[PDB]
Ligand binder design. Sequence first.
Ligand SMILES: [Mn+2]
Ligand SMILES: [Mn+2]
Lengths: 388, 582, 293, 7
Amino acid sequence: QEKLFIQKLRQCCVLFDFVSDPLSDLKWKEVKRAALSEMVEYITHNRNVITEPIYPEVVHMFAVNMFRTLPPSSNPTGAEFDPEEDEPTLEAAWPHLQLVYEFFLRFLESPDFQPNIAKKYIDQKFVLQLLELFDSEDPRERDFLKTTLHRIYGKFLGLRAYIRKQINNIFYRFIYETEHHNGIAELLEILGSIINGFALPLKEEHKIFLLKVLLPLHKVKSLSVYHPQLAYCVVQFLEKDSTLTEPVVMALLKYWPKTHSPKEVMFLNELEEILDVIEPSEFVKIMEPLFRQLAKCVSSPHFQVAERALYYWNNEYIMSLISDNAAKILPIMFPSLYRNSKTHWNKTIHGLIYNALKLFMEMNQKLFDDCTQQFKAEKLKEKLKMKE
Amino acid sequence: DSLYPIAVLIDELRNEDVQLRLNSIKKLSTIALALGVERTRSELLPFLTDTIYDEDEVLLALAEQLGTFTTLVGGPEYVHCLLPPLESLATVEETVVRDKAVESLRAISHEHSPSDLEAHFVPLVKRLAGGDWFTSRTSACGLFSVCYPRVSSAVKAELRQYFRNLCSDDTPMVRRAAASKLGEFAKVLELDNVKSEIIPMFSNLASDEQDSVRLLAVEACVNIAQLLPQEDLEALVMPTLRQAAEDKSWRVRYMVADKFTELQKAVGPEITKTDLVPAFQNLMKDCEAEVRAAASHKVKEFCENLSADCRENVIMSQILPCIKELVSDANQHVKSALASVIMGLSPILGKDNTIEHLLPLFLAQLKDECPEVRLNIISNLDCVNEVIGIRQLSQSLLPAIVELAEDAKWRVRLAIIEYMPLLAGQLGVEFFDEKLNSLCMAWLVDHVYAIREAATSNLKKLVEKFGKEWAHATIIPKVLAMSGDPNYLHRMTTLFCINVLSEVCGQDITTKHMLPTVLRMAGDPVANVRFNVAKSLQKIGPILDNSTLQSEVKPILEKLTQDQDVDVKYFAQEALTVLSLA
Amino acid sequence: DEKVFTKELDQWIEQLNECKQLSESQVKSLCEKAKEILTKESNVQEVRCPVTVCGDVHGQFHDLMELFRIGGKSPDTNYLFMGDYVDRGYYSVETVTLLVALKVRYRERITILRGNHESRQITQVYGFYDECLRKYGNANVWKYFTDLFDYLPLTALVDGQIFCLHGGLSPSIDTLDHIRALDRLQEVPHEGPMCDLLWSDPDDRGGWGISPRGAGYTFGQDISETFNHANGLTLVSRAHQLVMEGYNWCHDRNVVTIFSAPNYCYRCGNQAAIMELDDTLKYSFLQFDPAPR
Amino acid sequence: XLXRXXX
Ligand SMILES: [Mn+2]
Ligand SMILES: [Mn+2]
């Protein structure tokens, strides 16, 4: 017929309360595998541009195939195990859900489908239940949530307060209570786009979002998983207000791994990603203790660290800065670059260093020399008197 | 003869080399000692107070230190002096530190005089509870239990308000806290208040948006139920406790499963029969493997705790049906769990029922695929025969046991090798010597050492069961015709048993039927077998008579002290110095 | 003068058995003692039967323990491990600290061989390094151990008939003497005979192939058969690649692999086995599941 | 399969 505001509101209810537990392998009667791929090629393939009838049978439908307490983890404890090595456990009856998401997505994503066709049909309580969901089926299930929550956050200026706050709560627990959660990574991406679009004169709840939530996320040990998605947030955050540069860098410094080479490398990597954008007026506030550390990194016995540390030397910009401030930097870096590199096994660094040194001459001959002087001179005494 | 070191730690508390600043703080006690109380109070605390430390390892240590200064700060009159810094450590981000900061306030709280408490200690709890940042509020919760009992009627009311506030916090995190502490906080409030005040919070935290809160509510339900007198149980506790047994989030349910026998006792011996029994089934048939196996573990203790007059009746018409189902579950951990306690039911249903009902299940498990379920059942047979007839055992169970004695998974072969000496004793030696001896002899030569070791010792326990004379006629022979196996691993097995049989074979049998072979082997090609021969003579040493000792021992225990292989050498020597033969 | 040390190792061992690490001050000492003892050994250590050949252990301490619950316990039963003591696992230190301890003590009862992992560069990448930190604070127990590693002999010959090596055969190596000439007293090189002995693998592609690993080559049935016929080797035993079944035969019973790290890296899900060689070199393989933790 | 250098 031509009366659809009753063919779907009964067709959806069919695919709604369905509930087909695919954990017995019986009753192979699809039925619904279509009802959905239907409401799809119905709202997608220009079969419509007028399906705004006041009716939230979609939501209810969704919040029934999705909203369930996630099952008990199929992955081990967590001390002797690294999540980057967790065998993904795929949710069965995916080809079923796979659509419930798809539909709900190609739902309020389409034009003419007003926001108040949901305003009070998609309330905090819906959001929240959606959030937990951020938990286990190889990205697949997450990936969808990542997107769904994205678009919901970018259309209901009312749920922004909540979505945000409730995301924090998930992180504070990740950090201080259970050092376990699968969608931390996915979530940060969401917060990626979010940050990249805050108020020009940054509200003060964000500066707290950054300082008391984001940085502390580097403390965790499973960091190897959401590091890159994280760094982006830190960096992106510094482009929206280079004031926070100092406190962000002082944080990464306080935390800085001491028994986890791999993390030490990440920090270095993220730290360059920051210098790369650092602002001269700011670079100065950090500079001293920052390079005071790089100093140790070069002097590290872990080839992977040192290697990544010295690479700082091939950054046009980072070098640029060091120059305009060689005065102070150069001597902090010397004892370690010029260090008596004649006591190693990694037949590489010795050369990797020489190269940095050269790159340090072409910049300020005089200083370079004068520092040598100063160094040797000192070294001298510590060799004479220090032999009684 | 000096006071310099101590005076230096006092200078290394700000040394900027965290590794040192630690040590100093980590001994912060011997600084306030050589410091001198009246000082500690006016120089060391106002220093730890006006100094924000970073690195956690240090912060942790300061916190743990501060809890013992009760004395070094001058005793109870001035214990309220340690508050200021701890109150700050209570705020710290990294939990552990603030967790210890809390562990301390509690400890030193008991040292405050009620007068001080109302004046210095409560205030700290109030300030922590009202903190801008959740952490503080988190902490605060752990502090009510310890000051309430001693403050005044006026303050007790103020505290109760502040605590309800922590329960109704905008942060899941703080709520989950108030949640866990809700139990211990009730345990101190006066009765009336448990009813009018605790109860409400209890139910709310019990129906929180966050399930991770709600489940902590079930834990405190067990505590609240022990405070309330029966009657009121069906009015204030039960609505909520049933509610949780159903709760959508399997996590909440799982709790009611683990804290079941606990809830049993608290509730009553009756309300149990009224609500929990049905409720208990529900869990045994839960949708979540966990909650199921969970309840399984509780089966044995749930019953032994059922009303004295109906136990057998309900275990039979109510519980026993579901059990039979679980035995045949799909999830190992559930079969594996229930199979490790299922037997404790025998002594409840009696000789009869046990054989008509439970005994069959024992078989079901005794033969299951999952090593666990087998292993877990094999372990409680030392029993059964104390219910079923020792004949009923050796007839409808012994067969399996005879088969288990050699299934794949060695930890299981073991499980049998251990339950042997009992079966042997109960079954009788003649039964043993006939259709069971061949087994205990087989083990003596298993591929896995673990099994041989167990088997070796096993003998000593049999000789203790059937007298020396029996060994010299059914054991000592085979245990010797083994020394002829080419593989040294087995070849040694011999010297091993010997080292055990002598412990219980009188001075005779040892000297005339074992000492001969413990020597004849001292001339073996594989050194291992040689240095062990030496180590053996030291074991069967004392049991020999002085004359045999310096006759057939020393001389042959000499022909080794001068042997090639460094080991045999050392083991021959340390075989003398102990026997006192040089 | 003799019961002043031998009575203390006995304890260090007892300790390491409860799974408690020795102290930094101790590690260094243990290692030295170990050095002097390993210097004297050849690159092709010739140890007599009977024995128990074990493979990769990778800091899976407890699962090492299980092994002993199977093959018996040293010194009462002789052993021979083929490298890969550290890395992956959660208790490297304890594990290696132990195995070494046992050498220093019962010098003739156990034989340890170097593995692709007894080198700095790897230990650093895969974990032994970090664990050393996470457990000792400095980075000295690591140097102490990465140093003792260089003296570890490359290969072992069981009664002149069975050849043992962590990895495999190497082009630059044709005869056992070719190996007795090498100088193992150095860190594992990226390319070279020595390296290969510790990285090579058995391949079905036949004829020296390129190893998808990064070092060493993929010798084949042909290459194996020859090597054996050459020096007079009845069987070439090694281990260096997870063999789901504990041990695998390949190249027409010429070369066999033996992995001893069950459920490897606590993730892989493989049985692990060890090979016993009785008084007359008889092949008997004992498989075992990861100890119940 | 944990990363070639060897699951
Ligand atoms: Mn290897
Ligand atoms: Mn390996």
